[PDB]
């Protein structure tokens, strides 16, 4: 057993229906206020930006980037969590993901939206970005495929798509369920006509077998993509000549950062999706227990790389790469790295105490703090070796402006704004496979 | 329809690999960093990844084609 | 893209033959320079200053086969002949031009004057109100030798 | 560099050991008045927000020269072209004459013993293979 | 017997390969490394298979559980087979020469204040002899246990194996990284790469999945069993061989595109290996033969799960690690002359026989499939 619930096949439908039955929430009316206000602050500063110019962000030229692309790696590294528990957990077929899966590619796809805006916008010339695409354009010009900034585009313009199409396909039985309810019990007779995303669903033999092998396909075909998407977004760093980047362990590392970032947010959503609007019988606390292992895996795999970084400075480094990491510990950002590594190492090695700390309220206060180091992880790795790189002439601290922070905040805004939006429309839980996997769907009775 | 996934991988694979034999050397090349004109490696994460998109969607165009699922 | 690659393959051959005939001339001059200025100049870097081009010129001959054979192997891609021909003529006219710049210094020491038959010698761009370069290119072409530069110094 | 094709993702700059790919952060030229505009020379591409830029070896006066040699068949002399860093530095430090033209000053100043190659170790193979300093102290003479 | 034929033919061959340690001396020490570390990767890979089988517990591949556990106690025998390195250790790593830091030689190789603390050959003794206190301790704490839950079943049957996985787990991944940074990073120490601690790891757990898999595929056909271990068991092993072929080629290519790009001094692993001296031949015919033929042939699920194919792959999937690792170990000698010698192979077929000698003699010493176990019939009746 891996879900604790006194349920049958029917008990989920009445409940998740009650989570999508009628439209009168109040906490919604507060979240859609503060979150959309966050989104308003985002675009309030993001078109203030482009009419004016990039330098209102706090970017000097050595550190050309600052917080925006840092947040791109964040708001995509945060998102791999959702798609891989849809893919990986079917590849290993742990028959365990079902309680949370369908709420996760949401937690990916909206992250990818508030991610993709940054590559479109930390550039100065947004309008001239369609040149980046390989359209046969008005002259005989085409992009440069030796550039990981381009791989990012195809990757994310495929990863927004594959994760969507794998989520949209993931939620066909919902629309079947809701299309089936809209006639007999539901919002309106005209929600059925809205639920044509069922696409003539009947749950038949002839195509349900195909659905399995497709769900197998995208599992074994989005994971090789996930390991290339964030790896691309790491290749952009490590392909460079910078010593703090050219170290080759980074693509596995940042991926583990995406694990150790993404699940570090999913738990923040599940806790608050467990207290007020929660599923005690379907979101079993034992799930979060076995969830934080694959976090705590990367609670140490992330840690082993810091050793290698901190090691190769002592083993066979360039006399700059020797200095590159002494900078990280000792220098301006001692507030970051000493506390960051310690934050991302103490709390996981302080996590496993009382059988993985099943206690729910510790999850929120920890899952934040695990994640805050991630925004530092990419503010450290990117920038702490991007100044103090191969010249003293290019020595300059990075002062982030008051507009850097409202974009970060706004990224939380649009994330919650649009994550909540469809979430209230679609069903949260992967109700199709939940009642199909662990309960008595087995023919041995 | 893995035999129908056949045409998904090949065309995408050929697409990227034709998006560079047509692009990097023969039509508007460039001595960007001495990169030897669509040498394999920086093409791999496109000759791999862009294949995934155009090969997955065909993997699902089949899914939307087995007895033609859109029959509400 | 008029009629394929096989059209340009005649002129690219007509360039490589100019190179082959210049293997004789350059190596012939490399004998003559050792004969003309035996000891009338430094000559220790300045003779090797002329040889350093020569190992490149000969190296391009084996290439000009490889350049060309990569074209004539498959005549179905027009965007290689114009380029291989634009490369040859540049890799050709350069080496012609590099021979000259080393060969005009020969006269510059034997004669106290690098001669007024040296180059087009037109002038700056604001010296077009007086002297369009059109005049000059009909001076340079119809006066200056490409590689009859040191055989010219046999007359001195 | 082309001040047109760029977009402003700035990772043109982050690679380079020498953070010299500057970037037109704000649009300083748009607010430029009706007076200084006489001064920006009428031969080069002034640049708009969201664009990199760098030295270019004062390419502008390579072009008008090499073009002037494309009209009429010729080479480029030892001093037909002089860059701004060259023509202004009163100490004749910079020389700039075309490589692979052995009579020019650069080939004498590069063939010199101290072809100081700044951060060559990164296997970058750059031009402007410049020179070091030779500070000249004194024999003892009660110096120390 | 089943146990002594890979052993007597392999040790018959190893004792013959004493000729290597005697004749063409410096060749054999490093054909011994490419062999020795292969046996170690076999130990390293299939052990991590046991670990991950317990962390995110998997009752679906448990018939293929007891046999990896047999493979582990190799590594204690791999200790006493460390000896041939040690006589040639002063001849191999090029930092043991100690005529280079600041002696009278023309070379002051920048190793004095940087590396000499991490590397000093009596330290190298402990940097591996310490690992024998861990990777064997896993054996004496796991193999002593998992063989023993059969005859003396416990009240807490798995959760003691979990205890190994609770604190004996991470130290493994560490010691694998530093091991690779101590053995195979150091042949051309004019090189600095952080990933390579994983290329040794993944390139191990890549392989040993195959050897565990092909063993049953051999021991299913004319073995002691023929139908007990059903087909869909191996269906997972395929799903693993892909999910870890990715975790190899992701790494073997991230070692490549990153270093194909920058062209740094650390690249000199491959200005000598890849292009020159009959090894562009190797890398091409490697990668075509190492990633794509497996990733293509095994892919479709209409013969992916068949026993004899995946058994046939374990040959092409582990014999190739010679070709994978002969691209790392030996080429720093035959950098002048790519002429792979007969001694390069006697130790491959030797140690791949000698390890398997012990491997069957222990399966001769005691059981094969655990006579009682949690979820056994759940995986057998599958
Ligand atoms: S003067 Fe020199 S440094 Fe300045 S732009 Fe011109 S060439 Fe470059
Ligand atoms: S990376 Fe390229 S697109 Fe422009 S901003 Fe820099 S030259």
**DSSP result, A191-248:** TTTGGGGG-S----HHHHHHHHHHHHHHHHHHHHHHHHHHHHHHHHHHTSS-HHHH-T
Ligand 1 atom with the smallest distance to the CA of D84 is: 1
Is the Cβ–Cβ distance between A233 and A72 less than 8 Å?
yes
Q: Is D58 annotated as a binding residue?
A: yes
The CA distance from D94 to the nearest CA of chain E, in Å, is: 29
Is the Cβ–Cβ distance between A254 and A73 less than 8 Å?
yes
How buried is residue E195: exposed, middle or buried, by Cβ count under 10 Å (0-12/13-18/19+)? buried
The CA distance from B55 to the nearest CA of chain C, in Å, is: 30
Interface of B with E in 9-48 (CB under 8 A): 39, 41-42, 44-45
Give the number of other Cβ atoms within 10 Å of residue A236's Cβ: 23
User: How many A from CA of A297 to the centre of ligand 1?
Assistant: 52
CA-CA distance, B26 to B37, in Å (whole number)? 9
Choose the residue to mutate in D7, D21, D22, D24 for probing ligand 2, maximizing ligand atoms within 8 Å of C-beta.
D7
SS3 at position A105: helix
Q: Which residue in A has a C-alpha nearest to residue D121's C-alpha? A: A318
Length of chain C measured in residues: 156
Question: In Å, how far from its chain's centre is CA A66?
Answer: 20
User: What is the maximum alpha-carbon separation in chain B?
Assistant: 56
Identify which ligand lies nearest to the alpha carbon of D93: 1
Asked if C102 and D74 come within 8 Å (Cβ–Cβ), the reply is: no
SS3 at position D26: strand
Do the two chains A and C touch, given a threshold of 8 Å on CB pairs and at least 3 pairs?
A: no
Ligand 2 atom 1: residue of nearest CA:
D12
How buried is residue B14: exposed, middle or buried, by Cβ count under 10 Å (0-12/13-18/19+)? middle
How buried is residue D38: exposed, middle or buried, by Cβ count under 10 Å (0-12/13-18/19+)? exposed
Question: In Å, how far from its chain's centre is CA D35?
Answer: 28
Is the Cβ–Cβ distance between A49 and A64 less than 8 Å?
no
Q: Which residue in B has a C-alpha nearest to residue E284's C-alpha? A: B40
Residues of B in contact with A233 (CB under 8 A): none
List, in sequence order, the alpha helices (H) in chain E.
5-16, 18-22, 25-55, 66-72, 74-80, 83-92, 121-129, 135-138, 144-146, 148-151, 159-183, 196-220, 231-262, 280-287, 293-297, 307-325, 343-365, 376-380
CA-CA distance, A39 to A20, in Å (whole number)? 25
Task: Name, in order, each residue with C-beta under 8 angstroms of A153's C-beta and a sequence gap of 6 or more.
Answer: A119, A132, A133
Do the two chains E and B touch, given a threshold of 8 Å on CB pairs and at least 3 pairs?
A: yes
CA-CA distance, A267 to A359, in Å (whole number)? 12
Query: Which of A99, A95, A225 minimizes the C-alpha distance to A164?
Result: A225
CA-CA distance, C96 to E218, in Å (whole number)? 72
Q: Which residue in E has a C-alpha nearest to residue A87's C-alpha? A: E243
Residues of C in contact with D72 (CB under 8 A): 120, 122, 133-134, 136-137, 140
CA-CA distance, B22 to B9, in Å (whole number)? 19
The backbone torsions φ and ψ at residue E8, rounded to the nearest 5 degrees and listed phi first, read -70, -35
Name the region of E198 (left: φ>0; alpha: ψ -120 to 50; beta: rest): alpha
Is the Cβ–Cβ distance between E256 and B41 less than 8 Å?
yes
Please give the structure tokens belonging to residue A83.
Answer: 């798609």
The alpha-carbon radius of gyration of chain E (Å, integer) is 21
Query: Which of B29, B24, B67 minimizes the C-alpha distance to B47?
Result: B24
Asked if E243 and A223 come within 8 Å (Cβ–Cβ), the reply is: yes
Cα dihedral E301, E307, E310, E316, rounded to 10, equals: -150
Is the Cβ–Cβ distance between B49 and A228 less than 8 Å?
yes
Resolution, expressed in angstroms to one decimal: 3.9
CA-CA distance, E149 to E151, in Å (whole number)? 6
Residues with CB under 6 A from ligand 2: D 6-12, 52
Please give the structure tokens belonging to residue E68.
Answer: 């990896």
Query: Which of E203, E204, E229, E205 minimizes the C-alpha distance to E217?
Result: E229
Name the region of D21 (left: φ>0; alpha: ψ -120 to 50; beta: rest): beta
Q: Is D16 annotated as a binding residue?
A: yes
Interface of B with A in 4-23 (CB under 8 A): 5, 19-20, 23
Asked if A125 and D6 come within 8 Å (Cβ–Cβ), the reply is: yes
Please give the structure tokens belonging to residue A372.
Answer: 């805050």
CA-CA distance, A24 to A21, in Å (whole number)? 10
Is the Cβ–Cβ distance between A417 and A39 less than 8 Å?
yes
User: How many A from CA of D86 to the centre of ligand 1?
Assistant: 9
Q: Which residue in E has a C-alpha nearest to residue A318's C-alpha? A: E192
Is the Cβ–Cβ distance between D21 and D53 less than 8 Å?
yes
The backbone torsions φ and ψ at residue A118, rounded to the nearest 5 degrees and listed phi first, read -65, -55
Question: In Å, how far from its chain's centre is CA C79?
Answer: 25
How buried is residue D9: exposed, middle or buried, by Cβ count under 10 Å (0-12/13-18/19+)? buried
Cα dihedral E109, E111, E113, E118, rounded to 10, equals: -170
Q: Does D23 touch chain A (CB under 8 A)?
A: yes
User: How many A from CA of D61 to the centre of ligand 1?
Assistant: 11
Give the determination technique: cryo-EM
Identify which ligand lies nearest to the alpha carbon of D5: 2
Q: Residue D53 forms beta bridges with which residues?
A: D22
């Amino acid at each position: 057993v891996l879900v604790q619930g006194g349920l049958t096949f029917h008990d989920i439908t009445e409940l998740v229906a009650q989570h999508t039955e009628k439209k009168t929430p109040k906490a919604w009316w507060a979240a859609f206020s503060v979150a959309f206000l966050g989104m308003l602050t985002l675009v309030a500063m993001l078109a203030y930006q482009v009419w004016n110019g990039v330098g209102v962000w706090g970017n000097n030229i050595p550190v050309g980037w600052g917080w925006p692309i840092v947040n791109f790696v964040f708001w995509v590294g945060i998102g791999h969590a959702g798609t891989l528990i849809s893919a990986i957990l079917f590849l290993f077929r742990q028959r365990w993901r079902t309680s949370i899966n369908r709420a996760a590619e949401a937690m990916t796809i909206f992250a990818v939206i508030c991610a993709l805006i940054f590559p479109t916008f930390h550039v100065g010339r947004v309008w001239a970005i369609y040149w980046t695409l390989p359209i046969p354009n008005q002259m005989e010009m085409w992009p440069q495929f030796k550039s990981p900034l381009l791989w990012d585009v195809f990757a994310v313009s495929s990863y927004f798509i594959v994760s969507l199409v794998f989520w949209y396909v993931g939620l066909i039985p919902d629309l079947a369920t809701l299309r089936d309810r809209a006639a007999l019990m539901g919002r309106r007779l005209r929600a059925k006509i809205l639920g044509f995303f069922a696409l003539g669903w009947c749950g038949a033999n002839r195509h349900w077998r195909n659905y399995e092998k497709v769900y197998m396909l995208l599992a074994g075909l989005a994971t090789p993509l996930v390991l290339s998407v964030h790896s691309v977004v790491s290749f952009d760093f490590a392909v460079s000549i910078i010593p703090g980047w050219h170290t080759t362990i980074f693509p596995p590392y940042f991926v583990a950062g995406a694990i150790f970032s993404g699940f570090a947010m999913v738990v923040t959503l599940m806790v608050i999706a467990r207290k007020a609007y929660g599923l005690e019988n379907v979101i079993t606390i034992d799930h979060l227990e076995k969830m934080n292992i694959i976090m705590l895996v990367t609670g140490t795999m992330v840690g082993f790389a810091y050793i290698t970084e901190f090691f190769i400075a002592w083993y066979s480094g360039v006399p700059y790469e020797q200095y590159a990491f002494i900078n990280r510990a000792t220098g301006p950002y001692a507030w970051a790295y000493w506390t960051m590594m310690s934050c991302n190492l103490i709390f996981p090695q302080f996590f496993w105490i009382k059988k993985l700390r099943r206690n729910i309220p510790f999850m929120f206060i920890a899952s934040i703090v695990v994640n805050i180091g991630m925004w530092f992880e990419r503010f450290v790795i990117t920038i702490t070796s991007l100044h103090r790189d191969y010249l003293p002439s290019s020595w300059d601290y990075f002062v982030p402006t008051w507009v850097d922070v409202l974009t970060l905040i706004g990224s939380f805004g649009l994330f919650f704004t649009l994550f909540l939006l469809f979430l209230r429309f679609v069903p949260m839980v992967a109700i199709a496979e939940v009642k199909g996997v662990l309960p008595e769907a087995d023919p041995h009775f | 329809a893995f035999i129908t996934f056949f045409t998904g991988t090949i065309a995408g694979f050929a697409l990227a690999w034709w998006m560079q034999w047509w692009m990097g050397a023969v039509d508007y090349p460039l001595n960007i960093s001495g990169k030897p004109f669509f040498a394999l490696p920086p093409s791999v994460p496109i000759i791999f990844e862009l294949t995934i998109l155009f090969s997955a969607l065909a993997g699902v165009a089949t899914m939307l084609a087995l007895n033609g699922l859109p029959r509400p | 893209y008029p009629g394929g690659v096989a059209l340009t393959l005649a002129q690219i051959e007509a360039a490589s033959e100019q190179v082959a005939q210049d293997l004789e001339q350059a190596l012939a001059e490399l004998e003559a320079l050792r004969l003309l200025a035996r000891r009338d100049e430094t000559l220790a870097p300045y003779v090797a200053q002329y040889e350093a081009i020569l190992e490149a010129h000969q190296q391009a001959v084996l290439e000009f086969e490889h350049w060309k054979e990569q074209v004539a192997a498959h005549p179905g891609d027009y965007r290689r002949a114009n380029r291989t021909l634009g490369a040859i003529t540049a890799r050709h006219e350069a080496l012609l031009q590099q021979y000259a710049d080393v060969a005009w210094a020969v006269a510059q020491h034997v004669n106290p004057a690098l001669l007024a038959r040296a180059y087009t010698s037109s002038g700056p761009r604001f010296f077009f109100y007086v002297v369009p370069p059109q005049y000059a290119r009909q001076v340079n072409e119809q006066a200056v030798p490409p590689l009859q530069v040191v055989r010219y110094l046999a007359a001195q | 560099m082309v001040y047109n094709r760029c977009i402003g993702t700035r990772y043109c700059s982050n690679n380079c050991p020498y953070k010299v790919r500057r970037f037109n952060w704000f649009n300083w030229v748009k607010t430029l008045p009706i007076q200084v505009q006489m001064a920006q020379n009428p031969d080069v591409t002034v640049r708009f927000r969201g664009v990199m830029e760098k030295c270019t070896y004062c390419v502008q006066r390579i072009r008008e020269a090499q073009r002037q040699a494309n009209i009429e068949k010729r080479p480029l002399r030892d001093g037909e072209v002089k860059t701004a860093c060259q023509q202004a530095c009163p100490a004749e430090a910079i020389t700039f004459g075309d490589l692979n033209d052995p009579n020019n000053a650069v080939v004498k100043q590069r063939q010199n013993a101290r072809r100081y190659e700044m951060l060559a170790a990164l296997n970058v193979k750059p031009r402007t293979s410049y020179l070091a300093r030779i500070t000249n102290p004194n024999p003892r003479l009660l110096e120390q | 017997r089943i146990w002594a034929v890979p052993l007597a033919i392999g040790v018959g061959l190893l004792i013959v390969s004493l000729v290597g340690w005697a004749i063409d001396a410096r060749q054999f020490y490093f054909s011994y490394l490419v062999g020795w570390t292969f046996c170690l990767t076999l130990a390293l890979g299939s052990l991590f298979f046991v670990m991950i089988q317990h962390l995110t517990r998997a009752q679906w591949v448990v018939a293929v559980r007891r046999l990896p556990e047999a493979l582990v106690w190799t590594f204690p025998v791999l200790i006493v087979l460390f000896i041939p390195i040690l006589f040639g250790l002063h001849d191999l790593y090029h930092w043991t020469h100690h005529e280079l830091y600041d002696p009278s030689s023309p070379e002051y190789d920048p190793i004095l204040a940087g590396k000499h603390a991490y590397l000093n050959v009596p330290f190298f003794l402990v940097r591996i002899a310490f690992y024998f206190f861990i990777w064997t301790l896993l054996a004496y704490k796991l193999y002593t246990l998992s063989v023993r839950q059969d005859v003396d079943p416990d009240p807490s049957i798995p959760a003691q194996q979990r205890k190994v996985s609770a604190w004996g787990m991470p130290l493994y991944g560490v010691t694998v990284a530093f091991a690779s940074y101590d053995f195979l990073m150091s042949l051309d120490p004019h090189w600095y790469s952080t990933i390579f601690g994983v290329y040794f790891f993944a390139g191990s757990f890549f392989v040993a999945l195959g050897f565990i898999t092909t063993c049953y595929a051999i021991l299913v056909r004319r073995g002691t069993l023929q139908g007990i271990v059903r087909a869909p068991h191996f269906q997972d092993l395929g799903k693993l061989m892909f999910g870890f072929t990715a975790f190899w080629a992701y790494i073997a290519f991230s070692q490549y595109m990153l270093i194909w790009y920058g062209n740094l001094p650390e690249e000199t692993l491959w200005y000598r290996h890849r292009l020159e001296h009959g090894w562009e031949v190797l890398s091409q015919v490697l990668i075509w033969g190492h990633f794509v033929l497996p990733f293509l042939i095994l892919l479709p699920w209409a013969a992916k799960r068949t026993p004899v194919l995946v058994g046939t792959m374990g040959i092409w999937f582990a014999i190739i690690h010679w070709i994978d690792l002969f691209w790392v170990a030996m080429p720093v000698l035959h950098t002048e002359h790519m002429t792979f010698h007969w001694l390069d192979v006697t130790c491959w077929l030797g140690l791949f026989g000698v390890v398997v000698g012990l491997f069957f003699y222990r399966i001769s010493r005691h059981s094969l499939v655990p006579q009682n176990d949690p979820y056994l019939a759940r995986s057998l009746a599958l």
